[model samples]
Target: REHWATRLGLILAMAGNAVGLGNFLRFPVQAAENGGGAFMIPYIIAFLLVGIPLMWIEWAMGRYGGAQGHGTTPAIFYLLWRNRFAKILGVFGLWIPLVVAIYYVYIESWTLGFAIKFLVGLVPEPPPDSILRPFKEFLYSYIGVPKGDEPILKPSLFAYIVFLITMFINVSILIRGISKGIERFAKIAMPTLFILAVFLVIRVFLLETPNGTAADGLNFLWTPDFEKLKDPGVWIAAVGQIFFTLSLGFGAIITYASYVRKDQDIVLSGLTAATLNEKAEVILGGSISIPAAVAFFGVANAVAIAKAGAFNLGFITLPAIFSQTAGGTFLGFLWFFLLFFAGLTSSIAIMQPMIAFLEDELKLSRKHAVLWTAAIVFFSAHLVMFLNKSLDEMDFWAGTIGVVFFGLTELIIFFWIFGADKAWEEINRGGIIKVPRIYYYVMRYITPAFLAVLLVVWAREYIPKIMEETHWTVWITRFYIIGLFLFLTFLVFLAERRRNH
Candidate 1:
């Protein structure tokens, strides 16, 4: 098959995949909510233990699979262990990305709507008589979140239309295949994304309000309260952030790395992408929201804002702040444009793994694969907009929990079952700099152990909630995810039978 046209293009595409809307919205709030500077301690520690090693493992795994003419994890795992169970276990590789893409693209649609609105001077002014605070009203109305007596499933015409447009952009790019669509787009989008972020950082630096200065915001995120380090919750949040931020465990890296030439240096390529993601997260992400929020709303309010949610920070609070700031109309356009690009690039990556799966396992032509995948996403994504807790439910299961579970299996398959010595050689075969011996052991023992703890802890906390989640919408969401998983598994079984014949 197809491969990335150039090394630079591949790296940029991978970085774009890893750098998502979360970089700006979710990360700063996680840092603010967790412990500011204290949070970075476990964050960096978790990165060292899990993030870098997982990146290398997935890249190595993908290249190994690609060399064997299998791009999806099903055949990839079968190639690794030669077991029917291994292949079935690999259904997660397809399922997680597909399920996540449904809701994620919906959120991405919101960013696009905001970007276009700001660009067109259709600033959604807060109604003076509304009970809800200013931007909350605009955001709620924009997304069709039902108010007191409004119907729960009320649909916003704007959100519905914009989601279609966003889905079109994603499908069109995927339809072009890797080099032309994803890589070329990344070549353009990643640079533009970075440039926009730089401009926003510069703008945020100049923001000062009656409440606090930009410096106050920066210090709020940067200053560490070491006592907060004692909390296990802080460490858990750190690990979780690393997982989401780097796009580890979601099978995107594995699928993307599969497109590499057999002998390319994944060691350096993976490291570079991870570094770019971290820089965007800590440097660019940290610089934007916390600073801007504190500048306008003050530190205590910013803390409360972070506690509320990433959506509030990105959609509600930041937009309102931009409305009040000088030249904010223009900056608002740039900020949301930055978010849209960041989001679009990422949504592009997550969808590719499944398309590759359909092509590889089911022998669907690229056209058919794209059609089927797009159709599935189009139907399910609307559910996210219609149901209040559906997005959160899908995210908790498919996005957060599923990825960690998938990553644990990946790490075990690669390092433990595949053999550490062989895996080490695979990762370093074409490397620029030889990886340290320490990481070899890290991937072998420490990383897997780290992931086990993460999953166990998550299960302990959320499993109870999972049982108690009695909403019909939540059940519908759960059943949908379960149905998708079983269907993928059946397809895998059929592929196995076809192979046997």
Candidate 2:
């Protein structure tokens, strides 16, 4: 098996795959928007119910699949369940990251573009006094974020340069295969990401907002208002956040675990990886962005800063803070550089399952697999690359909604259809710590039911929002999804036919 050379490398690789832009940017927004400490109750509940269990489930399936000489989800699903339809369900595992990665890498370029500007004194000094205006100009002038009528694909030459550079870095790492390549990069990148974030967190703690101290930001985050528990949005957001944060059912974890040597302690590894991710998300993410925003904008107007979304907060608002604060130039470099590292780690992981799918099941050479997948992402990404709303549409499907839907399908299959009795035995095969027999009952009954209900609630709440998008961009996204999945479905058919023969 092509495996990680060291145990520490594997844990960092798992954290790298799980941690993304969400860990630092989007997570704090969730905490602030939802009710701060009030959010933790459901978040903790979902972690126990959905997070750890799904992590373990994917690890078990991936290791079992790898042992049988399978690398992708199609064969893994078929191995677990002998039904033809299992292949269709497994399609989600491959496509979610592939689809998300298409646009995600483009977002990564924005940070790279901004980072260069900060280093060279290109960003305007003194902020122009208004908070978001300079950032907006950078977006339009440098990044070429279109308003309504501009062309979608026309980025500034500088933005295009960074875009190509980011892709080059991602594809370069991807082509080298897993251990020698992805794991090596992870070992270096994850530590740097952590260190940069900690520096910023400490800096945030020392600063004061106009209305109150940094302690106000902490209070805003940690002060639980029980009133939020009554809102349905809080619970749903908790579930979505956990699923998104962990990258569960996304097949990246499955592919990573597939390389683990037989008899390796998957249960312990799964827990450690998940724990590390939670630390990053809750501790680091919760600390850094909002506190800084509150320091400058203060509590009254800080609400608007978060409403600008992660891109605006990172690229648009926080840079304003840098311009005013001492050592702003250096802080801007650390922030954007950390984002670049966070983006690279996950984008590299996203490429793996498809490369594995082609190389393992379709019997293509690794070179051909990397070449084919890169060509696919390169063209497909251009569809949403420069267009702002179109990228939003793509993210909604692949980044947010699609992952949850795909996750629900897997829980039903693994615990329900596959027979929980045998699945539990597989989980415990060499677990360092024994999983209680009670979880077998919980995994079989409670988990599947919870996911099903969450799916229904989410669809009822969000599907109408999706269907309301009747514009050309919406149709463009839907067609893109349709084409990619149809193409993957054909490959599944070809793989099954070839393997059976």
Candidate 3:
């Protein structure tokens, strides 16, 4: 039987999942680097065609699957096939979250480490090279990242142990169910995060240079850099960023939303979560982080700041910004606290699919499933700690290839496999906010065609770059090729079977 939870809990869970490390930290830097405000063009387009549509598709699938009360992979493949060819895709779908969970926990460990450092007043100013170099060196030496001059390093033994402990703590909170755990945390965290973000934005804007001139970082952020937008790379980056930032097509949202009761208005819930999530990123994330960085370090230095990568922004750059502004200590505390909470909520959401699988598929008790999965994720993520190069490879696969493939699949399944009319009906069924007929037309024809062309263009442009760098054996590349074909073949077979039945 479908296990339904509260409506508010589901919405919060979906929102929490969508709003994570990618939102506040990654999105603004990506947008600024790409085309500043002009990046919004392709980003908005992507949200319409790629983001919102894929979300609805997942919701529909989840609802349909929930009706069957099956786990994700089982639901997806079984909905496609009665028995045969089921396990193949089922395994693929199953592994997606499991693979993600492994690396995700590793990344979560980084967040926890940063949070602790911030709390202890251990973080230093930017040009993080000073602190980051030694940290990375220690991590590499102790853990096991690749060992070249620019080699990736694994997490150190200490870091790995801490990572395990943090994973256990997060999973334990989640096993307690939605209302008492997830919702409670979100209700407290989300508002505090927003307030801190707003306060930082104000303080950064108010800061004066040595000559008492107010910083012009706001212009650098909001002012459209039209010349940058002319570059095709900028457009691609924008679209890629939107995909990354929203966490769309990841199956995370679907898993979270699956817990909601039937007739809970999936369309409204999806749109509400999606829109709110984006608004948070753009308004608070973009307005605050990017501008604050520019105010502290100037535009040129901010670019250098971004190049320092993910952890730099969270730990080094932002802290440096906070230290220079008035009321630095309190603001810094709030900022890091918000980040910690954001990461915590998102991590819990990421672990949900595996939790669902253990409960629904293996019929394990929720507590047992949560504990076992947490342990598995903690141990497996150590793979990332031990092999930095391998971890980089996995990150590339997960963030780029995996996301793109799943996103395209979702677009195809909704517009092509399910039929646009059917999709429209499902989306519109309980939609409180009525969409126009034009939306249906676009959903049917225009959006799919647009995505198809964009997907092809994206692949052609990047596949060569990935090939040159990875230099995997031809056979290994061929394996991925075969995998892609097999995935499509399964979809085709499912479509045909549905027709016959």
Q: Per-residue alpha-carbon lDDT of model 1 for 1-501, expressed as tens digits?
A: 889999899999999999998799878888888868889889989888889999998999999999877888888988888887998889888888888899889889988998898999887654312322767867888887867653366657988899999988998899999999999999999989999999999988988867888999888777777898778778877887888889987888999999999988998899999999999999998999889888877888788877976687888777777777677778888999999999999998888888898888778998899988999899877678787788888888878778888888988988788888998999999998888889988888788887788678777885787769556668888888899899889888898777778
lDDT order, best first, reads 1, 2, 3
The best candidate by TM-score is 1
Q: For candidate 1, report its TM-score.
A: 0.96
lDDT (0 to 1) per candidate? 0.86, 0.81, 0.64
Backbone steric clashes in candidate 3, count? 5
**Model 3 segments more than 4 A misplaced:** 1-5, 71-74, 80-92, 124-158, 210-215, 228-230, 325-330, 470-501
Q: State which candidate has the highest lDDT.
A: 1
Give the range of the ten consecutive residues with the poorest summed lDDT in model 3. Answer: 472-481
What are the candidates' C-alpha RMSDs?
Answer: 1.9, 1.8, 5.0
What are the TM-scores, per candidate, against the unseen true structure? 0.96, 0.96, 0.84
Query: Candidate 2 residues 1-501, lDDT tens each?
Result: 577889998999999998988787677777777767888878888899888888898888888888877877888888788998998888888888788888888888888888898888788665224656766677668756666675465688888788888888888888887888888999999989999989888988887754666777777777777888877778888888888889886788889989887788898899999999999988888787777777776765666666656566777777877777887887898899998898889888788899999988888888888888878887887777655567777777877778777776776777777877778878888888877777777678887788778778878986887788555667877887778999998999898899899
User: Would you list the clashing residue pairs of candidate 2?
Assistant: 209-295
Q: How does model 3 score by TM-score?
A: 0.84
Give the poorly placed runs of model 2, Cα more than 4 Å off.
Answer: 127-129, 148-153
Off by over 4 Å in 1: 126-132, 149-151, 469-472
259 in model 1: Cα distance from truth in Å? Answer: 0.7
Least well predicted 10-residue stretch by lDDT in candidate 2: 125-134
